UniProtKB/Swiss-Prot annotation, chains A, B, C, D:
Catalyzed reactions per annotation: a tRNA precursor + 2 CTP + ATP = a tRNA with a 3' CCA end + 3 diphosphate; a tRNA with a 3' CCA end + 2 CTP + ATP = a tRNA with a 3' CCACCA end + 3 diphosphate
Family: Belongs to the tRNA nucleotidyltransferase/poly(A) polymerase family. Archaeal CCA-adding enzyme subfamily.
Effect of mutating R50A: High decrease in both AMP and CMP incorporation
Assembly, per entry: Homodimer.
Cofactors: Mg(2+)
Keywords: ATP-binding, Magnesium, Metal-binding, Nucleotide-binding, Nucleotidyltransferase, RNA repair, RNA-binding, Transferase, tRNA processing
Further remark: A single active site specifically recognizes both ATP and CTP and is responsible for their addition. In contrast to the eubacterial homologs, the specificity of the nucleotide-binding pocket is determined by both the enzyme and the tRNA.
Function: Catalyzes the addition and repair of the essential 3'-terminal CCA sequence in tRNAs without using a nucleic acid template. Adds these three nucleotides in the order of C, C, and A to the tRNA nucleotide-73, using CTP and ATP as substrates and producing inorganic pyrophosphate. tRNA 3'-terminal CCA addition is required both for tRNA processing and repair. Also involved in tRNA surveillance by mediating tandem CCA addition to generate a CCACCA at the 3' terminus of unstable tRNAs. While stable tRNAs receive only 3'-terminal CCA, unstable tRNAs are marked with CCACCA and rapidly degraded.
Top-rank lineage group of the source organism: Archaea
Keyword Cell membrane: no
Name of the protein this chain belongs to: CCA-adding enzyme
Gene3D superfamilies: Archaeal tRNA CCA-adding enzyme catalytic domain, Beta Polymerase, domain 2, CCA tRNA nucleotidyltransferase, domain 2, Poly(A) polymerase predicted RNA binding domain
Amino acid sequence: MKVEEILEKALELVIPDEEEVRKGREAEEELRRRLDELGVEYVFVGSYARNTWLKGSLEIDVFLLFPEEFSKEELRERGLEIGKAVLDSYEIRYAEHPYVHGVVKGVEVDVVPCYKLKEPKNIKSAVDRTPFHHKWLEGRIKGKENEVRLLKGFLKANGIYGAEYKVRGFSGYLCELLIVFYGSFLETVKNARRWTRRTVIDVAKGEVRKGEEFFVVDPVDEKRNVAANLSLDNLARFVHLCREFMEAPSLGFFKPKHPLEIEPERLRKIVEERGTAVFAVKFRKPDIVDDNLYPQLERASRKIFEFLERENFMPLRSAFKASEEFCYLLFECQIKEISRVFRRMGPQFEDERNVKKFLSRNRAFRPFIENGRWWAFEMRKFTTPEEGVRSYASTHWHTLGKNVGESIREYFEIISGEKLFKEPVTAELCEMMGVKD
Amino acid sequence: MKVEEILEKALELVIPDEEEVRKGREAEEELRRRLDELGVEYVFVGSYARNTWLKGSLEIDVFLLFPEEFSKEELRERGLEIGKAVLDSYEIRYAEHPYVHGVVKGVEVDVVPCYKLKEPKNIKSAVDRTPFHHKWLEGRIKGKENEVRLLKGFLKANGIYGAEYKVRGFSGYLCELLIVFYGSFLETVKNARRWTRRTVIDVAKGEVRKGEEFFVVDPVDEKRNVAANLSLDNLARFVHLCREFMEAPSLGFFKPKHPLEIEPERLRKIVEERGTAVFAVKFRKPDIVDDNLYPQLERASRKIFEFLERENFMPLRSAFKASEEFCYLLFECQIKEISRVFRRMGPQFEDERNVKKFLSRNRAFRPFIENGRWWAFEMRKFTTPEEGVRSYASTHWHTLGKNVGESIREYFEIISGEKLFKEPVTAELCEMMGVKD
Amino acid sequence: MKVEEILEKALELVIPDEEEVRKGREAEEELRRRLDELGVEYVFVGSYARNTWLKGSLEIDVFLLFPEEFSKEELRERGLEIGKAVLDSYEIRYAEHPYVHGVVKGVEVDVVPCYKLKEPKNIKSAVDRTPFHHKWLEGRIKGKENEVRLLKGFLKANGIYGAEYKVRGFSGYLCELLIVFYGSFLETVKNARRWTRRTVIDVAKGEVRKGEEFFVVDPVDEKRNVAANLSLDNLARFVHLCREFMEAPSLGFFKPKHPLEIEPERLRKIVEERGTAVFAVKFRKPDIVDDNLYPQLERASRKIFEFLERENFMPLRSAFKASEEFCYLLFECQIKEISRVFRRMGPQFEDERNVKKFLSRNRAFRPFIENGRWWAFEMRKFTTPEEGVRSYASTHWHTLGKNVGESIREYFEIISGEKLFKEPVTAELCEMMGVKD
Amino acid sequence: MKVEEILEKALELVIPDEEEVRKGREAEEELRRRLDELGVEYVFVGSYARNTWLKGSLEIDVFLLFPEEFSKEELRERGLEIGKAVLDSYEIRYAEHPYVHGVVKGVEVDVVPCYKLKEPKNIKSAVDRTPFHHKWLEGRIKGKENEVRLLKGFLKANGIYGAEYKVRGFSGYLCELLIVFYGSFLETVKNARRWTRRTVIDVAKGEVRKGEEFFVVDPVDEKRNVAANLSLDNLARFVHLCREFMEAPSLGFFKPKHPLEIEPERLRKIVEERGTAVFAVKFRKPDIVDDNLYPQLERASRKIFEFLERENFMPLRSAFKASEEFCYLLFECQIKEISRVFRRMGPQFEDERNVKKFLSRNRAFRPFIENGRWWAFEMRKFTTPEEGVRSYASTHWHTLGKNVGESIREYFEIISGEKLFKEPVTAELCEMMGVKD
RNA sequence: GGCCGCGGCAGGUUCGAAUCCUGCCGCGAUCGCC
RNA sequence: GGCCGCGGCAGGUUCGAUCCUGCCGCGGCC
RNA sequence: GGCCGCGGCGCCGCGAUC
């Protein structure tokens, strides 16, 4: 019902209120006062500094600017001292390098040390790019803050905001570049309908061209792809989302979807209708950050999926879920059970030695010749995908990711049938099988 | 035990007794009397003329020569007419060209018209080579007829004698060429152990060499392969047989093996242990010669096998049988049941026109994106190999051979489970599954 | 004396003599006989099959051609089986697939299994590319075999033939492509003088252009760089060698260089005069193949080099050496000894709290202010590069390569002075320091 | 069935048939005529001369009796000449002394030259004792030939007949002495039940004593033990077999046992259940006689076993097998994996010089004092028995037997897991793990 | 010839060997043994 | 006459072409 | 199997090379 009215109502869901702004302003003023006491060079960067952060996601980023002369150690020591002295309650977090996360008057704050550089050519670390990113945007994004907020809220409600591995979606910095390029949320959406997996957007040169992959050229560093970790599938989803929006605009595009929580009985009747084998590999979650866990959950799923393909259980899709205590690898297979007998390949009839060897082994049934080479009927170790995976996870745990694999070595179990519907994975199941609400 | 005594004992199971010879002599000289009255050019050829026919398989071949001053049409008229006016209880058989077949004083006889040719260059038809074959062998095979009979007996015992499509084995002409080449039965068996699927035996040039296929060069025409209809798997079986015989010689090799009759309950218990689906397509046998029938049964069997692979029922082997009234196509699949749901591939996400068309269809489940393409869960019309073949044979009867397919069109039934073991196909089922005695 | 006369004398050094060719032919014949006996499809490939192999380096490569339907497991099983059967004193090696290395009539052979492909697009495997490399070259290289041999000998004599990691030079395939491109060894050398680190040679297209890296396009796959593992410095050395050859042609360019082998006393005096700290980290060689060992020796020596840079010992160069039992990482530093006392950075003067903490630590000497920042004199844990490396190798063994690092972790020792000159590293030290003959 | 009838039945499996006697008798009488014409001093001895040879194991032993004047290599080459001019198809053989082996009219013959001695005082080698052994037995054994053959067959059916190193059991001569001592086969078995590892059987003195070891005094030489190469464990096995036989007599004791047939999968499941490390050392078999090979395989096994004990992998049992081309050294260990860290013992605390040296070695962790003594943590060079054996076999190949060790030096593999069950060692693995079915 | 058991000499391992393992020699045994 | 192989034509299948079908001549096989 | 580069926050994952 009228795009302009929808976008107007969508701002309410995204723009922070007076209270949250005032909460940030008071923390900012206190933060600067404490920093100025220490005589350190610093700069406020990121979403807060440009006023492009979402309602409910207030977080202040302060970058400490140190001379190029400093060592990495000196960069760390000094930085860790400034951070502790300036925050009410601090915590040492780790990324490319250590830094300090904490709180100032109720507001979350990151204090990150980096080098003060003259040109982007000296950029070695990623934290060294962040100040240049801010410098490039601070003037170009003015007046277009709410457009950024619309784009972010849009992506967030559809589960593709954030470039972290859990999402493999759009980074905040990517959104702001898109707004600078197209000028508004609506124009971004309109043009995105024609994006391909070979689209190259170059804000600095002000042009769109064709490349080898979907590439958003960092105006600060032409060799960097800002959308590097945006998956092909999430790109496709954004493009299709944009087509749907212009076709029939709705405020519902900006509203987070409520997961499908159906009764285990309806779920049982669905699986019965589909006639598939549905089961899960449950194991204890490794104590590691999301950015290590989720690529490993992806790897473990893929390996078991490929195994299921090789063993002729014909997997349809896989999925996974991480809770606080347990992880789950979910699978659906077209084959509930396969015959015990299978065909074992032998040598060609010409090979006297190896045929003799092949026929020497005792078997329940007689080998045979087909198309000039020997074959033998032999017996499978397992005849259901559940037991197949039980065997694979037992013996090939080392291939299911470093930490995920090691955990599966210590403990795992196969859960199938209606017992699986008791586990907290019904939402992932319904999504996996494409269940309509 | 030893070879020398084995072959001596084998000659008894191989050489026609004086009673069988006398039966043939009295039919020959009488048949010549009728060819002299009419005063027509004739010649006795084949296994009878060369005295190399195997015991029990007495059959006289008489070719009617006619001048080159005749068209392809004129030959059959005065050909068959001389045939009918010479044979007592005659009929008409169809293989290549029309010819007469009838019994004269006990034994059956075949009268084939053909041209009288000077050199083997004016050879248009295949029956034009038969005189030259006989003329090439009649001198060279003298003194080696028992060696020929041993090889024929050895082959007929193990179901690979005869080049007709029912057998796809060794022709009688091929057998005699091999004996002339190797000098004896024992030397043929000894050397054949080293035959490969690319061995070339050039009889006239007295050399073996490597080629593109198993090729026995016809002395009369170097471009012809005497072993053309000898299948690859029957070659393999002969090589393997020859190896086993030299290793542990026995008269049993010259005696046909037991029919192997298994009771329906042990057969049921076997199928259970294998865990496979076993079923048959039953239809009424077309009234055609075996050389037309068996290639069509092979085709129908293959087409259904390929359908089963394509539909992911994972067939193991197939076979077929033809009784007097019915034909059977036998199959064994590793999949008894597949899921109702399956994946249908859609267009890539950039392709808006086709994505819209792909998503417009109503389905029970939500389509999804994967690796840049759309995919849809859809439903199979059948979930068992039996039900799949019911559908296939019903709508694709036409491609199951000209006559076999037409019969299947008029009537067929799928027979599975215990009810199949009542059908007269137990021998073929046991062979197919490699059931050992 | 003339360029062409030298090339004529050089042919004697690179062309295989009659005896070696005969040794190859007879091995080939016996190998073909063994393979044909087994019925397998195969193809001779590589330098031997194309007659471009270098004098004294006779080696036969045979690829077993399997159908695409074979699984990897079947491919590997049938491959190894055939390899073990046709080769004497065989040996199982491990590349992409395990393959069989062995001997046939005194000649070394590789039997490698691969897929028989129709189009090069089905290639995701390096061994699958080899048959296509052969088909592309077998015709185009005819009449140019001696030119390839000239180029290989030129490269080998100067230690840059072979793309394996020990060499990081030119592969045989690359050499042959270059000869096809330029037509001769002389033209290749003449044009190579103008090569740069951005040169792109497109062989199939017969053009040269500029790119991001030195890139020789594989005619079978335009995405592949045939010179991928040619190091930058070895490219540089070849270009320089080419300029030198054309300037003053000599047969010496084709002759291997003999090691220096100077007396330990002379080497000692050279190091004394240079006034440098020269030492080695000695540890046991891991039982791994060259292609894993050498990249790890490169990493380890590089990591220790960087440590020495950080610790202000001012390294000049590093080198390494692998013997059968031991490995050596060699270093030369401009600093033999650094002062005990050093400068420790403190906080800026404004920071009252951290200054206090900084000044509260007990020290032998008083802290001081310089450029608005507090500093303190503190003591180094080590004062020689030998002891620094001793510490670093002890505590950071994990960064010196997985296998090399694990070895050093178990045992290493720092050798220097007269003890070092007794170790078998004289050649490497001389080269490292640029000692003239 | 009574014992008497079982023994009556057993004779059938044990006495050579009339054709075998006529074969040997004709070969004998013919072998004499050739020896008499030359006018050479000869004597028939051994199991044939006394008619005690077991069914199927016919061998004619002829000894050439030469004067004492011809020393060593004088009669060695002369007797060898006589051996050729009497045998049909001969061949030379070694084993502690030289001789000639061949055939005479299908029967196998040995021709061993030796000294003609007055009394058993002039004894030099074992070849000089044989005629005296024969002389001592030829009269006493008369009428008890079948008792000897029962004992021989009994032992052979249980793999403990023969003194050769592959067996380490009862020699034929020992068997005869035992029958002469106890009178019959049945009395030997009854009394053997009470044999201990200190039983001394003195035939010449007709008594049993208690001594230091199992000792059967040779009636020809009181100093030598006829049961010298009978192992303690085969003595044990025989005594246990005799107890079993008298408790529940059976003809089965005279029939050899078929090896245990077992699926690789069951074997994998077994090793999983046991939780042990099971692996083999595979290498090419040296071309040497059994009497040299097997003692070397025993030595190699023992050495590696002792290495495994020392390195705390806690081996259970070992075994070995020789195939046609390869040997296998099998091991089962209770430790699949051991920690990298271990304790190294240092000097006593008061020993200042040695403490200083011990502590001078740089190490990852701090040394410590325990019970008046210094200790340090250090790192193993391997953490699995597989890694350990690979290292040990590489460095200490020389000690693993003369020929066996040299072969290992050239090449060996370590095979474990499921790959090992493909090797022809399943019977041995079943035996050493005590697998029953 | 190979293996087995003792005596002698030379190495390796070690902070340090009469002893812990490798090698070269002498004397017996087994197939001292075979 | 059937089967197999090789070419051209017209339809099914699919979101749309890879894949199944039918029709005509060429070569092999019984 | 190891090495190099990319990605996300030194640890993981993915590409290139042998």
